[PDB]
Design a binder for this molecule. Structure first.
Ligand code: ADP
Ligand code: ADP
Ligand code: ADP
Ligand code: ADP
Ligand code: MG
Ligand code: MG
Ligand code: MG
Ligand code: MG
Ligand code: MG
Lengths: 144, 50, 106, 537, 524, 536
């Protein structure tokens, strides 16, 4: 056998990879979609050490579940990032990322280039930041 | 439209861009897709194109 | 070079080709084995052999006849087969001499 | 060797083109040519030791352990369990020589192997294998014309058979039956001349029955001008000898007649039963009475008969043979001059054959009997009865005598004769060398190689005879060129003289031409191959 | 690329899609071409393939080689198919077609990798193919004289060219004369079943021969056949489909008698049935008797006593050829054996041919059939001889039907490459590149000729490209001189339909392979 | 084996092995072709354990891959060498080497001798280098600092810091100018790999920070120590501050119990005295490559100093060079005593422990005696942060090359089109077979703009034809030589003056790419046989 790459090296490419990544992300989102808001319901997770985790926390859930798709891995990692940075919004972030990828799937199917989509996303992010800072209000932290 | 070369379980080769033929020679196993294929084959039977 | 000792073997799996000295060696050894077997039956003071077949019937013969002895043995050497057939043809032509012709050939 | 396809893709996706391509092999180009040449050289060097009077035999063992000792190249290569396809081609080449000629089956193989061995060096020097094949074709044409030029002619008449006997002795010199050299040559010649159509120039070998029986000595082999059958008289009290035998040849079993169509004879009364009984009795009596009234003293049936017929023959003094095979019935008819009769009603005194002696022959302490029919008037059929001390020498005697008969046939077909002992090969090599000298193109090398290959037969004869190959061959070549005498060859038998015309060493011109042509054509077909594909295991 | 609880297709479906799949198809076609490249031209070589049973086939014929290769690639099967189609429609050019198709694919491979639309590529291919075909039809030399000597010269030259690639090239004049006599002695239909090809192991190529008549091997004679004579000097010939032997008068027939007199009558009646058939055959004057059905020993001996010749179980094709040669009809009944239904030849003989016995019917002047008898030192030798002769025969047939000749050695390919380069330099610039690639692809025939011969294809193609642009259209590769030459004067002639169909088939295969954009293998 | 040659292995020979080598090289190049240019896309790589790597760097991809074929390992090592010697072009060099191999094997199939192909490639490489150096370079002096910014933005296009290039290029340029230093021989040196790059998932990319000073991936050793110091006097030590243990060849053997107490206390008082000597000079921040026992950390705590342990040797060397300190492996002078001079101290306008998302690090700000630079990259996860690190390293190397050699060339296939034209015209003069080899070299060079357009999803044929038309007009009409600067605009699918658009690459990138690609093609093309021995 005269191979160029080692056997077990499988290479996927193209719109199959793009749609697969987007589906993995939106699946990670669908996992915890119902754990958002005041009327959420608990989930009982079973650790490999015979333990139990009864929670509503997006990062807790995604940290207790295990995946093999690298897109899902990346989504769990960004949930961890959100939790470590601010300590809240760990499932709002997941849902927003899933929805953004979902809506980008449209333009990707419609021959738009991912770099074009990305430039649009970055413009929109800057303008989101501007709008948030404009609509924000101050706080007197001395008011217990 | 580009042609496809479908090889069925009997190792027979079909080179075509005829949708109903491609569907026939594929082994569609999901039931909803099977239903869409049933619709396509009924269209082929009734009209012959489309 | 040679049919057997060539970079390519020209034969089906299981065949073989003994060349000059190897062939003469196997031939002489087979013939002389047959002859040494069939002698000691030669002459008035010759002694008999027990054939003792190995089939499921396990036939048992006590013979002094060289033709009978050679007919009733499992021979695999071609030269030995030649001598066996020679003794059989002697036994067909005349009824005696089947041990002397074999001993002489050997 | 190398595999069919070794990419699997420039993109990582499966690349499957041929079925079981991973288990399949392939050899391409000059390495393929050299593999072919190596295989052919192996076969040829196996065969070259069985060439000439001092040539030795080979002991072939089949799948079931039966032994065959032989010097016949075609029989050897047929018994040889070869796997290489080029060796299979060489077996086919030898078989073709045997079909067309019946002699030369070892010369063809040796010569083809030599041609390929020389092509090996020519390919090393970089010549195109097709150019080699074309130079070989050119040199082969030159050698064929030189054979036609140096050929001699012999008389194929039935009065003086000494030239034919010399030819047959040359053919049989290399076989185990050279202990009875002249007896075997005489009987091969007399056989073909008795059964040979001189006007048509055809010789039907179905009319020559070559029978062998263990016992006796090789010297006991004789020519029967007639037929021998492996049967005896039907009744044990019949006489064992019949002189001045008028023979009735019949293919009707001496039994009550029987329709071929599905039939049911219905018995419906005691009178019907008695009529049937009397019909059967009278049928038997009528058959025997018809055979007797024909005047015959002997009957020969093809389909056997029953107790009533046997005893009626005995009572009526009609010795009879039964269960004789179709071919032997035909031979008996042809030999005795009789006509084969399908039923007794059609039998007449003119359809009978005549043999001056019909005898039953014993073979010592065996209980087996044979029937000889001979002393016919002008038998156009004949039998060769071979005796010997073992079935191995009997079978070798059979095939050697077949070679001799085929050689006499080739003489009857074309009386032209070249002299052997490698003399013809040396002369053709000289002619090819001269033509290569006169050739200015690149085929000069191929023609010189063809000459050096033609010279392997005298070298092989010398080697098998213990002489020094190069010395002997160069001296006889020098003598041929100096004193123009293409009858100078190898003194294999050490008679002193190198003159094959004086030693009566004789070959057939069509035989030598067929050798050269077949060797050249097969070498061309082998050199034209540059790619082998074979299935795994 | 994500798991689903229920998958759309059956587990194991392998789908290759896109530019990689297309490039891989082109590569597989390149492999298939490589498998036959070295057989092209007078310096071409033979291939030895072996089956699972261990039986080897040795061939120069590209169609044969590709049939024997167990090709399974869906795109590479197309080259095998077009080689089959070429062998069908023409009978020669099978290697050229595959080489041309694969070279078209190789030439367009770069643009395929750079994203050129396959529809554009196939449009360019169709355009260039139509142009080249019309140019062949325009510049093909068709002598409008209908002279018989010139038409035999033409057929002999086309056959010599078609044979100057095989293992019988050293006898191609001989075999070409024989092939030409054969197809010129055939009837209007030029049926291939009307040319017999017997293969008798043993003998030389020059010992092979053509029989202006019919010949077939002796067929299982019974006793008395040697008592029969074996040469007749003006025989009348009875061709029959009749079993002549004692047999059940019918398989569903049952005789019922209740008397021994009736029993004996029935026995004698069977015998009289047979003897009456034989007596009718004997009284028809026929001295030779051939039956598609068995002829028993009784009938054999009857004919031997009447000094007649009989042969049974003769094969149907040999019987039909004997009929077309001698001029009779095959009879299932022997009740009307008139001279109109009997056949006739000037000589009938049974001779020995290399270990076998053969019956020869010679001297038939009204013969619309001939039989080749091929000699050689091996089964595969004779098989490749037969294949070469089949190539030559098909060529001669097509030439007889349309004597419009072009020159070979790559002359026509170089002329068309020049013409297509010229045409491409006059179009916008997208189709320009693709038609120029077509043109460069056409050069694969002289290039491969020089390769197989051992020359510098680069220098020779430079010489040819130069000489074809200076004026001159039949200049191609000269093999024996390692140079170029006017191949129309050197008599390297090729029927125009050969190259027309080669271009058509190669372009169609290329267009198909390039139109395929996805491959879906279902699990077995 | 089956052949007469008894070697215990397989043997490929001739067109078989040549086609195999080309197939391998093409495979490797087709892996990376999709990651070339501003429209290229990134790749995931999974390491059989779930370890994920996002990347656009061709060298990184080919290092992570597990290659089995030697002709493909050659190209992998080629990409590695390009990354070592240049820092950019790691994909283009592989693509060009593979295309040179393809065309050269096509010529060898047409039976041009490989020696002749190799001579032609060597000639074409030399003449392409010369033509670039003579006609296609732009002086960064004539262009100013926006030249550096444009080179950085050009390098960052095709990376995940592309559109943010407007700001990342400013950061990169500021950092390289900060770490600029001149040595003996008065040559300006820009020692990248001295810019520290830290990664910390969290705030957006735009929130990445340029530190005027140095950033240390370390923390204080004790929570009782301060975590901010303003007038930082810095002591860099290459030895450990622990309870002193006698060395291997020294043993304590007591025969008078009254000495044991003093010996045991001395074992700690030695290090105590060393620490007091260090602290007496004013050192309030102490970085150490070794460890610091708790006993010592308590001394630092009581002194109000900031001690840091297990610092890395390279980080310490950089902090020392940047702050003016002297790394001490020992407190030992030329007088056989133990002292610490205030001249061995360094200075910094502040040293603080700053809180990054969920970790903590130390920032040394405004060091004197030299300026230093660190960059804290901030993204959405470790994958993003690692790819940002690799992209930023590429950009830093690019700016370094632009500042060392003051020549740039335009991008977007401008150089490749110009070289294709010039070399297809130049081949006409050199031999007859080397001519074909040089023409094929020229045609091969076009694989870069072809790939750029293919990835941009544009008509590669039309675009490269327009490019070649422009550059031929430039090389045949002396009045339009300004057309040399035309290349691809992959956002619009139209040629464009890339010198005015700001698509610049360091000349060294293209030159070294060409030289290395030619060397790789020559070495692989020289192979006409292969003997693969069966392992033992
Ligand atoms: N009474 C005897 N005295 C001397 N020699 C004898 C006597 N009887 C037999 N022989 C010798 O013994 C041999 C016979 O031995 P036997 O066992 O019959 O051998 P084979 O089977 O070959 O005939 C003969 O050669 C004969 O000369
Ligand atoms: N008595 C002889 N003296 C010299 N040469 C002989 C003699 N008999 C045969 N030869 C040569 O031996 C060669 C080999 O023939 P042989 O091997 O006997 O038959 P085949 O070649 O058919 O097996 C022949 O070419 C012949 O010329
Ligand atoms: N004598 C010759 N000289 C030069 N070229 C020839 C000669 N004979 C045939 N050719 C060329 O060889 C090419 C292929 O020959 P051949 O192998 O017979 O074709 P195929 O294998 O396709 O049937 C033809 O295109 C023809 O032009
Ligand atoms: N803005 C741009 N417009 C056109 N081409 C560009 C631009 N930026 C980079 N390129 C081209 O991209 C090619 C390499 O891109 P990239 O993959 O980022 O570099 P590397 O070769 O180091 O992998 C260069 O040849 C360059 O000409
Ligand atoms: Mg919350
Ligand atoms: Mg439609
Ligand atoms: Mg002989
Ligand atoms: Mg042909
Ligand atoms: Mg880059």
């Amino acid at each position: 056998p005269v191979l160029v790459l080692s056997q077990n090296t499988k290479r996927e490419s193209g719109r199959k990879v793009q749609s697969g990544n987007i589906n993995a992300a939106k699946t990670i989102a669908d996992i915890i979609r119902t754990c958002l808001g005041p009327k959420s319901m608990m989930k009982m997770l079973l650790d490999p050490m015979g333990g139990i985790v009864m929670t509503n926390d997006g990062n807790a859930i995604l940290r207790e579940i295990q995946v093999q798709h690298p897109a899902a891995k990346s989504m769990i990692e960004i949930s961890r990032t959100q939790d470590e940075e601010v300590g809240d919004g760990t499932t709002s972030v997941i849902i927003l990322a899933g929805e953004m990828l979902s809506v980008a799937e449209h333009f990707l199917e419609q021959q738009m280039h991912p770099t074009v989509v990305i430039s649009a996303y970055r413009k929109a992010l800057d303008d989101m930041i501007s709008t948030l800072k404009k609509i924000s209000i101050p706080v007197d932290i001395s008011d217990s | 439209g580009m042609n496809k070369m479908v090889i069925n379980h009997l190792e027979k080769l079909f080179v075509t861009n005829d949708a109903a033929t491609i569907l026939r020679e594929l082994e569609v196993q999901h039931p909803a897709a099977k239903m869409i294929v049933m619709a396509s084959h009924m269209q082929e039977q009734e009209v012959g194109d489309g | 070079a040679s049919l057997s000792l060539a970079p390519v073997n020209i034969f089906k799996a299981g065949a073989d080709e003994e060349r000059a000295e190897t062939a003469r060696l196997t031939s002489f050894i087979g013939a002389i084995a047959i002859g040494d077997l069939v002698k000691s039956t030669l002459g008035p003071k010759g002694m008999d052999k027990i054939l003792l077949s190995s089939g499921r019937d396990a036939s048992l013969m006590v013979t002094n006849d060289g033709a009978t002895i050679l007919k009733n043995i499992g021979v695999d050497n071609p030269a030995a087969k030649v001598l066996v057939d020679m003794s059989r043809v002697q036994d067909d032509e005349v009824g005696d001499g089947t041990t002397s012709v074999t001993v002489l050939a050997a | 060797a190398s595999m069919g396809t070794l990419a699997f893709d420039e993109y990582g996706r499966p690349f499957l083109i041929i079925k079981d391509q991973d288990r399949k092999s392939r050899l391409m180009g000059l390495e393929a040519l050299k593999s072919h040449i190596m295989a052919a050289k192996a076969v040829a060097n196996t065969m070259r030791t069985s060439l000439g009077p001092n040539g030795l035999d080979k002991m072939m063992v089949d799948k079931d352990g039966d032994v065959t000792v032989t010097n016949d190249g075609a029989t050897i290569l047929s018994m040889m369990d070869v796997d290489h396809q080029i060796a299979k081609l060489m077996v086919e080449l030898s078989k073709s020589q045997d079909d067309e000629i019946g002699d030369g089956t070892t010369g063809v193989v040796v010569l083809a192997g030599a041609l390929l061995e020389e092509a090996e060096q020519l390919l090393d020097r970089g010549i195109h294998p097709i150019r080699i094949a074309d130079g070989y074709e050119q040199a082969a044409r030159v050698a064929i014309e030189h054979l036609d030029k140096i050929s001699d002619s012999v008389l194929v008449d039935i009065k003086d058979t000494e030239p034919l006997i010399q030819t047959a002795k040359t053919t049989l010199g290399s076989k185990v039956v050279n202990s009875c050299h002249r007896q075997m040559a005489e009987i091969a010649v007399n056989a073909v001349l008795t059964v040979a159509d001189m006007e048509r120039r055809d010789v039907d070998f179905e009319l020559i029955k070559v029978e062998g029986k263990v016992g006796g000595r090789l010297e006991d082999t004789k020519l029967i001008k007639g037929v021998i059958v492996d049967k005896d008289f039907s009744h044990p009290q019949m006489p064992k000898k019949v002189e001045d035998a008028k023979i009735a040849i019949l293919t009707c079993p001496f039994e009550p007649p029987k329709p071929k169509t599905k039939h049911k004879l219905d018995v419906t009364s005691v009178e019907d039963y008695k009529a049937l009984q009397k019909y059967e009795k009278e049928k038997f009596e009528e058959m025997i009475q018809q055979i007797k009234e024909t005047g015959a003293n002997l009957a020969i049936c093809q389909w056997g008969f029953d107790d009533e017929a046997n005893h009626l023959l005995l009572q009526n003094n009609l010795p009879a043979v039964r269960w004789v095979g179709g071919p032997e019935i035909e031979l008996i008819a042809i030999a005795t001059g009789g006509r084969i009769v399908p039923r007794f009603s059609e039998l007449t005194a003119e359809k009978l054959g005549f043999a001056g002696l019909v005898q039953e022959i014993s073979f010592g302490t065996t209980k087996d009997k044979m029937l000889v029919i001979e002393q016919c008037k002008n038998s156009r059929a004949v039998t060769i009865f071979i005796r010997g001390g073992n079935k191995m020498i009997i079978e070798e005697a059979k095939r050697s005598l077949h070679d001799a008969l085929c050689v006499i046939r080739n003489l009857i077909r074309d009386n032209r004769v070249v002299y052997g002992g490698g003399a013809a090969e040396i002369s053709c090599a000289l002619a090819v060398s001269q033509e290569a000298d006169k050739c200015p193109t690149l085929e000069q090398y191929a023609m010189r190689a063809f000459a050096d290959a033609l010279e392997v037969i005298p070298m092989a004869l010398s080697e098998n005879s213990g002489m020094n190959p190069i010395q002997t061959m160069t001296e006889v070549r020098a003598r041929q060129v100096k004193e123009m005498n293409p009858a100078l060859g190898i003194d294999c038998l050490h008679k002193g003289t190198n003159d094959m015309k004086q030693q009566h060493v004789i070959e057939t011109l069509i035989g030598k031409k067929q050798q050269i042509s077949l060797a050249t054509q097969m070498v061309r077909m082998i050199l034209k191959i540059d790619d082998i594909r074979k299935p795994g295991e | 690329m994500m798991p689903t609880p229920v998958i759309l297709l059956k587990e194991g479906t392998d789908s290759s899609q896109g530019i990689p799949q297309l490039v891989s198809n082109i590569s597989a076609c390149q492999v298939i071409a490589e498998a036959v490249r070295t057989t092209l031209g007078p310096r071409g070589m033979d291939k030895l393939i072996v089956d699972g049973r261990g039986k080897a086939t040795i061939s120069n014929d590209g169609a044969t080689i590709l049939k024997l290769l167990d090709v399974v690639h869906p795109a590479a099967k197309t080259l095998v198919d077009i080689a089959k189609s070429q062998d069908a429609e023409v009978g020669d050019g099978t290697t050229s077609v595959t080489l041309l198709a694969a070279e078209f694919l190789k030439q367009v491979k770069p643009y395929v990798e750079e994203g050129l639309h396959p529809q554009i590529i196939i449009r360019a291919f169709r355009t260039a193919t139509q142009l080249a075909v019309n140019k062949i039809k325009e510049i093909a030399v068709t002598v409008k004289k209908a002279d018989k000597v010139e038409q035999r010269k033409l057929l002999e030259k086309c056959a010599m060219t078609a044979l100057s690639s095989k293992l019988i090239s050293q006898q191609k004049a001989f075999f070409a004369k024989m092939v030409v006599d054969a197809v010129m002695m055939l009837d209007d239909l030029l049926q291939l079943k009307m040319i017999g090809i017997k293969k008798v192991q043993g003998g030389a190529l020059e010992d092979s021969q053509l029989v202006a008549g019919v010949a077939f091997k002796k067929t299982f004679s019974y006793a008395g056949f040697e008592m029969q004579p074996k040469k007749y000097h003006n025989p009348k010939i009875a061709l029959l489909n009749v079993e002549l032997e004692l047999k059940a008068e019918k398989d569903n027939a049952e005789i019922r008698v209740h008397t021994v007199e009736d029993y004996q009558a029935i026995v004698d009646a069977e015998w009289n049935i047979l003897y009456d058939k034989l007596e009718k055959i004997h009284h028809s004057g026929a001295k030779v008797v051939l039956s598609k059905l068995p002829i028993g020993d009784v009938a054999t001996q009857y004919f031997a006593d009447r000094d007649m010749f009989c042969a049974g179980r003769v094969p149907e094709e040999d019987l039909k050829r004997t009929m077309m040669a001698c001029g009779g009809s095959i009879q299932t009944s022997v009740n009307a054996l008139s001279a109109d239904v009997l056949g006739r030849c000037q000589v009938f003989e049974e001779t020995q041919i290399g270990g076998e016995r053969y019956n020869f019917f010679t001297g038939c002047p009204k013969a619309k059939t001939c039989t080749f008898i091929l000699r050689g030192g091996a089964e595969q030798f004779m098989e490749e001889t037969e294949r070469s002769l089949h190539d030559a025969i098909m060529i001669v047939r097509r030439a007889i039907k349309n004597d419009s000749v072009v020159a070979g050695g790559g002359a026509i390919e170089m002329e068309l490459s020049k013409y297509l380069r010229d045409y491409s330099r006059t179009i916008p610039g997208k189709q320009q590149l693709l038609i120029g690639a077509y043109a460069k692809a056409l050069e694969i025939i002289p290039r491969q000729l020089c390769d197989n011969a051992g020359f510098d294809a680069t220098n020779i193609l430079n010489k040819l490209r130069a000489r074809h642009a200076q004026g001159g259209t039949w200049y191609g590769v000269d093999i024996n001189n390692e140079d170029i030459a006017d191949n129309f004067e050197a008599f390297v002639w090729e029927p125009a339909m050969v190259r027309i169909n080669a271009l058509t088939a190669a372009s169609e295969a290329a267009c198909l392979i390039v139109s395929v954009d996805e491959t879906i293998k279902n699990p077995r | 084996m089956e052949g007469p040659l008894s070697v215990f292995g397989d043997r490929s020979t001739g067109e078989t092995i040549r086609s195999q080598n080309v197939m391998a090289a093409a495979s490797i190049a087709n892996i990376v072709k999709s990651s070339l240019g501003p429209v290229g896309l990134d790749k995931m790589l999974v390491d059989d354990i779930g370890d994920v790597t996002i990347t656009n760097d061709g060298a990184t991809i080919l290092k992570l891959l597990e290659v089995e074929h030697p002709a493909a390992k050659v190209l992998c090592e080629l990409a590695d060498l390009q990354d070592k010697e240049v820092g950019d072009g790691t994909t283009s060099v592989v693509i060009i080497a593979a295309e040179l191999l393809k065309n050269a094997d096509e010529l060898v199939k047409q039976k041009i001798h490989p020696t002749s192909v190799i001579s032609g490639y060597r000639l074409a490489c030399k003449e392409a280098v010369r033509y670039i150096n003579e006609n296609l370079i732009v002086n960064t002096d004539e262009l100013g600092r926006d030249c550096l910014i444009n080179a950085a933005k050009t390098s960052m296009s095709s990376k995940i810091i592309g559109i943010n290039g407007d700001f990342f290029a400013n950061m990169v340029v500021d950092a390289v100018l900060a770490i600029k230093y001149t040595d003996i021989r008065g040559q300006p040196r820009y020692p990248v790999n001295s810019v520290n790059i830290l990664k910390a998932h969290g705030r957006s990319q735009m929130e990445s920070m340029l530190i005027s000073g140095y950033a240390l991936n370390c923390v204080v050793g004790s929570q009782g120590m301060p975590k901010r110091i303003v007038n930082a006097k810095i002591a860099c030590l290459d030895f450990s501050l622990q309870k002193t243990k006698m060395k291997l060849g020294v043993q304590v053997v007591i025969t008078d119990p009254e000495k044991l107490d003093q010996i045991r206390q001395r074992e700690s008082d030695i290090t105590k005295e060393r620490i007091q000597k260090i602290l007496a000079t004013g050192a309030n921040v102490i970085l150490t490559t070794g460890g610091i026992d708790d006993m010592c950390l308590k001394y630092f705590v009581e002194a109000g100093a900031m001690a840091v342990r297990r610092v890395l040797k390279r980080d310490l060397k950089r902090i020392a060079k940047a702050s003016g300190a002297t790394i001490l492996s020992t407190l030992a002078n030329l007088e056989g005593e133990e002292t610490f001079e205030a001249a061995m101290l360094g200075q910094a306008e502040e040293v603080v422990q700053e809180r990054i998302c969920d970790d903590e690090l130390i920032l040394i700000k405004n060091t004197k005696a030299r300026t230093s630079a660190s960059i804290i990259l901030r993204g959405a996860n470790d994958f993003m942060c690692d790819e940002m690190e690799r992209s930023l390293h590429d950009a830093l190397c690019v700016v370094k090359r632009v500042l060392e050699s003051k020549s740039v060339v335009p991008g977007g296939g401008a150089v490749e089109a110009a070289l294709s034209i010039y070399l297809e015209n130049y081949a006409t003069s050199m031999g007859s077979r080397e001519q074909l080899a040089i023409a094929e070299f020229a045609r091969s060079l076009l694989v870069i703009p072809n790939t750029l357009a293919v990835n941009a999803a544009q008509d590669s044929t039309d675009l490269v034809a327009k490019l070649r038309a422009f550059h031929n007009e430039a090389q045949v009409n002396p009045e339009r030589k300004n057309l040399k600067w035309i290349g691809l605009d992959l956002s619009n699918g139209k040629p464009r003056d890339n010198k005015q658009a700001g698509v610049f690459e360091p000349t060294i990138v293209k030159v070294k790419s060409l030289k290395f690609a030619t060397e790789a093609a020559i070495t692989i093309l020289r192979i006409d046989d292969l003997i693969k021995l069966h392992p033992e």
